[PDB]
Design an enzyme around this catalytic site. Structure first.
Site, PDB file in Angstrom:
ATOM      1  N   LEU A 212      92.664-102.394   6.586  1.00  0.00           N
ATOM      2  CA  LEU A 212      91.772-103.291   7.336  1.00  0.00           C
ATOM      3  C   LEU A 212      90.298-102.949   7.166  1.00  0.00           C
ATOM      4  O   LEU A 212      89.468-103.842   6.998  1.00  0.00           O
ATOM      5  CB  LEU A 212      92.128-103.314   8.832  1.00  0.00           C
TER       6      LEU A 212
ATOM      7  N   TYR B 256      82.829 -92.875   4.592  1.00  0.00           N
ATOM      8  CA  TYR B 256      81.965 -93.904   4.001  1.00  0.00           C
ATOM      9  C   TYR B 256      81.465 -93.662   2.564  1.00  0.00           C
ATOM     10  O   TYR B 256      80.970 -94.588   1.931  1.00  0.00           O
ATOM     11  CB  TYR B 256      80.817 -94.227   4.976  1.00  0.00           C
TER      12      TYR B 256
ATOM     13  N   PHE C  14      72.327 -96.375  15.713  1.00  0.00           N
ATOM     14  CA  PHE C  14      72.765 -97.750  15.939  1.00  0.00           C
ATOM     15  C   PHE C  14      74.210 -97.884  15.508  1.00  0.00           C
ATOM     16  O   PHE C  14      74.858 -98.899  15.793  1.00  0.00           O
ATOM     17  CB  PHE C  14      71.872 -98.752  15.189  1.00  0.00           C
TER      18      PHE C  14
HETATM   19  C1  LIG Z   1      74.282 -99.616  19.215  1.00  0.00           C
HETATM   20  C2  LIG Z   1      75.725 -99.265  19.416  1.00  0.00           C
HETATM   21  C3  LIG Z   1      76.842-100.233  19.384  1.00  0.00           C
HETATM   22  C4  LIG Z   1      76.807-101.704  19.181  1.00  0.00           C
HETATM   23  C5  LIG Z   1      77.437-102.550  20.081  1.00  0.00           C
HETATM   24  C6  LIG Z   1      77.369-103.925  19.900  1.00  0.00           C
HETATM   25  C7  LIG Z   1      76.657-104.456  18.832  1.00  0.00           C
HETATM   26 CL1  LIG Z   1      76.604-106.235  18.638  1.00  0.00          CL
HETATM   27  C8  LIG Z   1      76.008-103.614  17.936  1.00  0.00           C
HETATM   28  C9  LIG Z   1      76.076-102.236  18.118  1.00  0.00           C
HETATM   29  S1  LIG Z   1      78.246 -99.412  19.661  1.00  0.00           S
HETATM   30  O1  LIG Z   1      79.131 -99.483  18.529  1.00  0.00           O
HETATM   31  O2  LIG Z   1      78.891 -99.824  20.874  1.00  0.00           O
HETATM   32  N1  LIG Z   1      77.717 -97.905  19.832  1.00  0.00           N
HETATM   33  C10 LIG Z   1      76.362 -97.939  19.683  1.00  0.00           C
HETATM   34  N2  LIG Z   1      75.590 -96.823  19.766  1.00  0.00           N
HETATM   35  C11 LIG Z   1      76.130 -95.496  20.009  1.00  0.00           C
HETATM   36  C12 LIG Z   1      76.044 -94.592  18.777  1.00  0.00           C
HETATM   37  C13 LIG Z   1      76.244 -95.286  17.419  1.00  0.00           C
HETATM   38  N3  LIG Z   1      77.613 -95.111  16.878  1.00  0.00           N
HETATM   39  C14 LIG Z   1      78.535 -96.010  17.612  1.00  0.00           C
HETATM   40  C15 LIG Z   1      79.968 -95.913  17.110  1.00  0.00           C
HETATM   41  C16 LIG Z   1      79.964 -96.379  15.681  1.00  0.00           C
HETATM   42  C17 LIG Z   1      81.029 -97.080  15.131  1.00  0.00           C
HETATM   43  C18 LIG Z   1      80.988 -97.494  13.804  1.00  0.00           C
HETATM   44  C19 LIG Z   1      79.882 -97.223  12.998  1.00  0.00           C
HETATM   45  C20 LIG Z   1      78.792 -96.525  13.517  1.00  0.00           C
HETATM   46  C21 LIG Z   1      78.783 -96.083  14.841  1.00  0.00           C
HETATM   47  C22 LIG Z   1      77.597 -95.318  15.404  1.00  0.00           C
END
Ligand SMILES: CC1=C(c2ccc(Cl)cc2)S(=O)(=O)N=C1NCCCN1CCc2ccccc2C1
Ligand SMILES: CC1=C(c2ccc(Cl)cc2)S(=O)(=O)N=C1NCCCN1CCc2ccccc2C1
Ligand SMILES: CC1=C(c2ccc(Cl)cc2)S(=O)(=O)N=C1NCCCN1CCc2ccccc2C1
Ligand SMILES: CC1=C(c2ccc(Cl)cc2)S(=O)(=O)N=C1NCCCN1CCc2ccccc2C1
Ligand SMILES: [Cl-]
Ligand SMILES: [Cl-]
Ligand SMILES: [Cl-]
Ligand SMILES: [Cl-]
Lengths: 396, 396, 396, 396
Positions: free
Chosen positions: C90, C120, C396
Site C-alpha cells: 500500500l 524512505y 511537518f
Molecule cells: C503536521 C502534522 C500532521 C498533519 C496532519 C494533517 C495534515 Cl492535512 C497534514 C499534516 S500529522 O501527521 O498529524 N503529524 C504532524 N506533525 C507531527 C510531527 C510530524 N510527523 C508526523 C507523523 C508523520 C507521518 C508520516 C510522515 C511524516 C510524519 C512526521
C-alpha cells in the site's frame, strides 16, 4: 570451506571461537572436562579453505522421560559460527552432519539449551521444559499451618560447606534425576565442575553454602552486587518434607530481603506460605529443547497416563513419517501406516509435547498441530501428561 | 460499634471510606452504576457507636465453570475498614454476616479479587484463576508458517471506534463467556462503564481503539507515559482464526515497540511466532478467588473430564463436611457420609481446584490436601482438569 | 482495494487512521488547519474493497536552498497504512501515485520528516539536514570575554508573552528562513498553531514564554516532569549579537539546572562559553529528507561555492538520467548526455548532498557514490558546501 | 615553594600525586614505560618549601597534519596539582616553564587531552579534534546494497588473538597515521602497553579480540557489566573495503545487542546501513587540544585545500604576532607585518582551526575571530578544510 571431525590441533582454535562467541564461556580447563562426555566423532568443525570458523558437538547424556524411563540422549552444545562467516549456511551444514551421525549412532532423541528462541525450531527442536524464576520477599514470608515440619524440637536441615558433603549431594541428586522427567545423569566430572563453581572468586561470585537434609539439598550464594538477594543455584528434594524444610531454612536467612530460584511452573513453594503472592514469578523461559530423532522409538519408550482409556489414531510428522498410534494401559505402540492422518504436526511440535510441558490443545489453538477431532485432542492432552511435573536438570 | 444494612443516607459516608481506601476508586457515578448489581440486603456497614468505619457487599454474578455450566455467584467487593479502626475484628464480623446471607440466599459459590494475597484464605477463599502478563517485542515478531490467516487477499480485521460497535462486542463477549471457565455475564451497566473508560481523559488515559473480527475483538490504548507501549485491556476471541488475526493486526502497530496484555497461562500467542521467547511473561498473579459455599451443590454442578474412568472416594472439607464423591462419565455425585476420609483439605483449597487452575498433586506436595493414596491424586488431577483453559473475565 | 483522491466524507476515517497511527497526532482541529496547505488532488486514500486503510498527502511548501534560492517543495505528510493491511504494497502504491502527481505538477523537489530511518531511501529520499540536541548545564556556564553583548548598561532582550508579540516573531522568522538553507515559509495558519501550542494544558505542557530581541527570539517552557529542565522549542536569530544575547538570557534562568535545544551541528553556542564541554550533545538525528524530482532543475536552481574553480563532469543518477554537469562562478549548468559517467549515485544520495549537510567524500567512503577520480570528489565536496550552515525549520 | 626538574628520587612522590589525582592512573609500571618518551628536561615538579605538590611534563610526539605533513609535537601529560595546594598559581607557573622549554627546544606545536574543558583555553590550547561515540543496535543492522564486500565466497576478515598479530597491527596503524590528520606515531613501548591492556583482568576488563583485514583491524571486548554490549577500543582502516568488511564482521557478533565505538563525525558507518539512524550518536566531546607555539612555522608547514584560489590577508594572533598570510596552490607563506589586521583571534582559536575540525565562520559567529570581511571567512573555511577528515589517534 570444508566440514570434518576435529583433530587435537583444532582445539585451541575452537576455544578461541568459543571465547569470542559465548560471554559465559567456561574456559579451556572446564571445556576440557566437559569434553570427556563427547564421544569419538561427536564433534564437527569448519575450517576456512587455517582457522576454525564453525563448530558443533554433542555429548552423551541420559535423559529421564515420563514413566521413569531413561533414554540415551545426544546433547548438542558448543555450537558457534564465526562473526566473519555468517549467512553462509554453516550452521545448517553442521547440524545436518551431526543429526546424521546422531541418528546412525542410535540415539532416539537429541537435546539442547537455546541461545535464542528463533533458531532451532527449523531443525526439528521444540522447547520441552519451562524455567520459572520465583523471587520471595522473605521478610513477609510466613508458613501455612498445614506446611510440613512446623512442630517443636530440632531442625532436620544443616548448614554445611558444599565440598565436605559431595557424596550426600550426589546420592540425593541421583535419586531425584531417576524419578523426574527432564532429569539428567550427572557424571563425576560435572560434580567436579559444580563444586569448583561453589568457591568464591576474586572480583567474581561469592562463596556458596549448602542446606542439607537427608532427602534434599539447596546450594545458594549471596548475589555479587545486590547484597540483600540470595540466589539458590540448585534445590533438589525427593520428598515434600525435604522441600518444605529446605525453604523454612532459606526463609530463615534473616540478613536477606529476597531469595530467588530458577524452578518449574509446578513448584509448590507458593502454597507453603500464607500469602501465595509473596512467591513472585519474575522470569519465564524455555529450558530444555528436544528433537525426536526416531518417532516410533521415542513414542514407544515413554510412559503415558493410565487415566485415559485405550484409543488409536494416525499421526503424521511433517517429514518424519506416518504412524498408527495406539495408547492404552500407560503404554504406546507406534507402527508404520499409509492410512489417512488424523493428526499432523512438525517434528519440533512433538518434542514440545514429549515431556508433558505443553498441551496438545494449546498447540492446536496456534495451528501447530492440525486435526478435525477435538475428542482426539482431549485424549492426547491427557495421555501425554506427566504424573510427576517436568523439570530442568542442568544447562549444558 | 454495630453492624447493619446501609440506608440511602449511609452511601456518602461509604464513598468517603472508599475514596480513602482504594487508590483505584472508580468514583461516585461509577460506584452508583455497579450498585445496580447489589441485591437488597447485599451490603453491610459498621457505624462508630455517626460515620461509617467499615463496609462490604456482594453483587449478583453469573460464573461459568467447566462443562459450560453457569452458577449464580456472589461477588464480594467494596470491602474496606477505616484506617482508624484496624485490628478490631471488623472484617471478620462483616465477612461472617455476608457469608450467612449469601448461604441463606442460595448461592453455591462466592468470589472476589484480592487486594492482597494473605487476607482471604482464612475466610475460605482460594485463588482459582491465574493472570499472566505477556509483553511482545513486536519489532522482531514474525508469524510461523503454520499460523492461521497468512494467505493473500484482504484482512478480516477492522480498526474501529469502540463506541460505534458496542453491539458486536457484546455479542462476541456473550459467546466467549458461556464457553470459558471463569467467564462472567457482563450486564448492560458494565458495558456502559467499559465504553466510558475507552475515551481519553485530560491528564489521564489516552483514547482506546478496537480491532474487530466477526469472531473476536481487542481493545487497546497507548500507555500514558511509555509512548512505545500499547496495552491491550481486553482481547476476546471465540475461534483460533480470530485470535491469530487479531494478533497479526496488533503486531502491525508499527509505531509501537511493545504490546502488552494480561492473559492466561495457556494463551497460544507464543506458539504463533517463529520465536516463542518474544512473548515474554513479565508478570504473574492470582486472578479470581473462590469460596465454595455449598460443597455438594458446587461439586455436582461442575462437569468433569471424560477421560478418567469412574472412581469413588471420601472427601472431608476441614469444617464444611464429609462426602462420598463418585465421579464418572464427566459427572459427580456427592452425598453425606461418616465413612473414613481418603482426602482432606481446607475449604479454600477446594476453591483453588474447582476451575482447574491448580492441580491436586501440586497442592498435595505443599500438604494443603492430605491423602495416603497417590493413585487417587492422579485421578483428581485428571478429573478436575478443564478441557477449555481457565480464564479471568473482568475485575470487580 | 482501490486508490483515489479523498472526498469530504473520507476525512473522519482518515482522522481515525491518524489517531491510531501517530502517537503525536495533532487532532482533528489542527489537522484541519494544516489541510489548508494541501492542494486540490494533493491527497490519496486507499479504501477496503468502506473504511480507509491507507492515506498519504503532500503540502505546498517553500524551501530555501543554498544561494538563498526558494524552491516550490512538495511536503509529504500524514502517511499511514492500517495495522490490519501491512505488507500489502500500500505504501509503495501511494508513494508512486503521489510522486507522479508531484512531478506532473512541476515540483523540482519533495520533502518529509521520517518516522523511521529505514523506510524512505528506497523511494528516493535522502536525509538532508541534521538535528543536534544540546543540553547546557547552566549552573557552570560562563561567557567568554570575546562573546558579544557583555558590556555595561541595559539588556537588549525582553521576557514576553508569546501571543502579544506575534508580529515581531513573524517578521524575524521570515528574515531567518529566506537566508538559511532548510528554511521554510511559515504561513498564517502555522503561526496560529504555534501560538496555540504556547499555552499551558491541564495535565500537559506548561506555559511557554519568549525572549525577544530586535533580531531574534527564543520560545521556551519548563519540562512537564523535570522541573529543573527548560526546553527551548525554537530559537531564531539573524545576527550573532542576537544569538549571544538570547543565550545570555537563557543562561540567566537561575531556577533551572539545564537548558536544552534542538539545533544544528554548527550552532556556535559551545564557543560562546569558557568551557565548550558544558554544551553537551545529548541527541543526534536526521531532520528533513529530500527527494530530487527533477535532477537538472534542482541542480541548476541551487547556488554553489565560489571558491572552487570551474570544472565539468558527467553525473549518472541510478534511474533519474545522465547529465553533463558544469559548475563555475557559483552556478551550475546540467544538460543531457550519453557520454561515459564519471560519478554515479542513487537518487536519495543526491538529496543528502543537496543542502550541504553531507560531504560527497563521506558518501563515497560508504560506496554510496562511485567514482575513480578523487580530485572530482574534492571538487564536489567544495562546490556543494553551503556558506550558511544547513538548518531545520519546523517539522511537518 | 620552588619549581625544578625532577631527580630520580622525586618519582615515587610523583606517582603518589598521580595515583591521588587520576582515577584512571595507569600505575607505576606503565607510567615508567611512557616515561621513555619524556625527553631530558621534559618534566617539572614543585616541592613544598619535602613532598611534590605539583608536576607536569611533555612527551616527544609526531603529529600528522593536513597534507600528510608530520610535525614534532610536545604532548603535555601527567599534569597535577595537590588538593592541598589549589589556587596558589602552581599550574600557571608549571605551564609557563614548560612552554618556555618547548618553544626553546623548537617544537612548532604542543598538544594535550583535557581533563576538563574550561582549563586550557587560557594557556593557548584550542580543541582540534572531535570524538563521536556511535552505538549500533546490531539486531536491526542490515547493509545497503551498495556497501563493499557483499558478494559470494569467503570473508576477508579473520578473528584473531591480538598478541599473535602485533606486526600486522603495527604496519596497518603506521599506514593509517601517516595519511590522517590527527595521527600519532605509536612507538614500540606504546604497542607493549596496548597489548597488555588486551588481556583480561581479575575483577576488571574482559579479554580483547581482534578482527584482522589486510588493510585494517578492530580491537574489541565485551563490556564488563553490560554483557550485551561490545566496545570497539580501536578500529583502523586504510581502505573503504577494509572499513566495511570490519563492520560486517562486528555486526556479525550475534551474542551482542549493541556495538559501540569512539570515532569521528565523518565516520561513514551510518551510510553503510539501510537505516542510518541505527548508528546512534550517544556521546560527543573534544579530543586532541592544540597550542600553536610558532605561528608562521605551523601555518607554513600545513597543506591547504587546492580548490580555493590564491588569496592574501593579514592575521593577528592576540599576543603571538601579526602576519601577512598568503595562501595559494595548497601552500601558505606567512611573514611578519605591521599592516592593518584583517582577521584577529586568540592563539587557542588558531589551534581549533588548524586541523580542520572547526570552521572559521562558526568561530566568527561566536566572535572568537573578528573580521569585517565575509568573503575572507569563506576563503579561510575553504582553505583550512582537510581533504581527509580529522581523527584522534590515542589518548596520552
Ligand atoms: C503536521 C502534522 C500532521 C498533519 C496532519 C494533517 C495534515 Cl492535512 C497534514 C499534516 S500529522 O501527521 O498529524 N503529524 C504532524 N506533525 C507531527 C510531527 C510530524 N510527523 C508526523 C507523523 C508523520 C507521518 C508520516 C510522515 C511524516 C510524519 C512526521
Ligand atoms: C557446558 C558448556 C559448554 C561446553 C564447552 C565445551 C564442551 Cl566440549 C561442551 C560444552 S559452553 O558452550 O562453553 N557453555 C556451556 N555452558 C554454559 C551455558 C550453556 N549454553 C552455552 C552456549 C551455548 C551454545 C550453543 C548451544 C547451547 C548453548 C548453551
Ligand atoms: C467494581 C469496583 C468497585 C465497586 C464500587 C461500588 C460497588 Cl456498589 C461495587 C464495586 S470498587 O471497590 O470501587 N473498585 C472496583 N474495581 C477496581 C478493581 C477491583 N478491586 C477494587 C478494590 C477491592 C476492594 C475489596 C475487594 C476487592 C477489590 C477489587
Ligand atoms: C598516558 C597517561 C599518563 C602518563 C603517565 C606517566 C607519564 Cl611519564 C606520561 C603519561 S597518565 O597521566 O597517568 N594517564 C594517562 N592516560 C590516561 C588518559 C589521559 N589523561 C590522563 C590524565 C591527564 C592529566 C593531565 C593532562 C592530560 C591527561 C589525559
Ligand atoms: Cl527446575
Ligand atoms: Cl484471561
Ligand atoms: Cl536547527
Ligand atoms: Cl577517531
Amino acid at each position: 570451506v570444508t566440514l570434518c571431525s576435529p583433530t587435537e590441533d583444532d582445539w585451541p582454535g575452537m576455544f578461541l571461537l568459543a571465547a569470542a562467541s559465548f560471554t559465559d564461556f567456561i574456559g579451556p580447563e572446564s571445556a576440557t572436562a566437559w569434553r570427556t562426555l563427547v564421544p569419538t566423532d561427536g564433534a564437527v568443525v569448519v575450517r576456512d579453505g587455517s582457522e576454525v570458523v564453525g563448530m558443533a558437538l554433542y555429548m552423551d547424556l541420559r535423559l529421564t522421560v515420563p514413566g521413569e524411563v531413561v533414554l540415551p540422549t545426544a546433547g548438542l552444545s558448543f555450537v558457534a559460527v564465526a562473526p566473519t562467516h555468517r549467512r553462509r549456511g554453516l550452521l545448517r551444514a553442521m547440524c545436518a552432519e551431526l543429526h546424521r551421525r546422531i541418528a546412525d549412532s542410535g540415539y532416539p532423541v537429541a537435546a539442547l539449551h537455546a541461545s535464542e528462541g528463533g533458531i532451532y525450531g527449523r531443525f526439528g527442536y521444540g522447547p520441552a521444559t519451562t524455567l520459572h524464576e520465583l523471587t520471595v520477599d522473605r521478610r513477609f514470608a510466613r508458613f501455612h499451618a498445614d506446611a510440613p515440619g512446623g512442630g517443636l524440637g530440632g531442625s532436620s536441615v544443616r548448614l554445611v560447606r558444599p565440598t565436605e558433603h559431595r557424596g550426600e549431594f550426589e546420592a540425593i541428586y541421583e535419586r531425584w534425576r531417576q524419578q523426574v522427567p527432564g532429569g539428567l545423569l550427572r557424571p563425576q566430572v560435572l560434580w567436579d565442575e559444580l563444586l569448583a563453581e561453589a568457591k568464591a572468586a576474586p572480583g567474581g561470585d561469592r562463596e556458596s553454602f549448602a542446606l542439607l537434609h537427608p532427602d534434599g539439598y539447596a546450594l545458594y550464594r549471596v548475589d555479587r552486587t545486590d547484597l540483600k538477594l540470595a540466589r539458590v543455584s540448585e534445590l533438589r528434594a525427593v520428598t515434600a518434607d525435604a522441600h518444605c524444610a529446605l525453604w523454612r531454612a532459606l526463609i530463615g536467612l534473616d540478613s536477606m530481603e529476597r531469595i530467588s530460584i530458577i524452578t518449574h511452573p509446578q513448584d509448590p513453594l507458593p502454597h507453603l506460605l500464607t500469602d501465595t503472592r509473596l512467591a513472585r514469578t519474575t522470569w519465564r523461559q524455555d529450558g530444555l529443547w528436544l528433537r525426536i530423532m526416531n518417532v516410533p522409538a521415542a513414542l514407544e519408550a515413554r510412559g503415558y497416563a493410565h487415566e485415559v482409556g485405550e484409543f488409536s489414531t494416525v499421526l503424521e510428522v511433517s517429514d518424519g513419517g506416518r504412524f498408527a498410534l495406539k495408547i492404552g494401559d500407560g503404554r504406546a505402540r507406534c507402527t508404520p501406516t499409509d492410512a489417512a492422518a488424523e493428526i499432523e504436526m512438525d517434528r519440533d511440535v512433538l518434542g514440545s509435547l514429549y515431556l508433558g510441558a505443553h498441551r496438545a490443545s494449546t498447540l492446536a489453538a496456534a495451528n501447530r498441530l492440525r486435526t478435525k477431532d477435538s475428542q482426539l485432542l482431549r485424549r492426547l492432552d491427557a495421555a501425554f501428561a506427566s504424573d510427576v511435573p517436568v523439570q530442568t536438570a542442568f544447562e549444558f
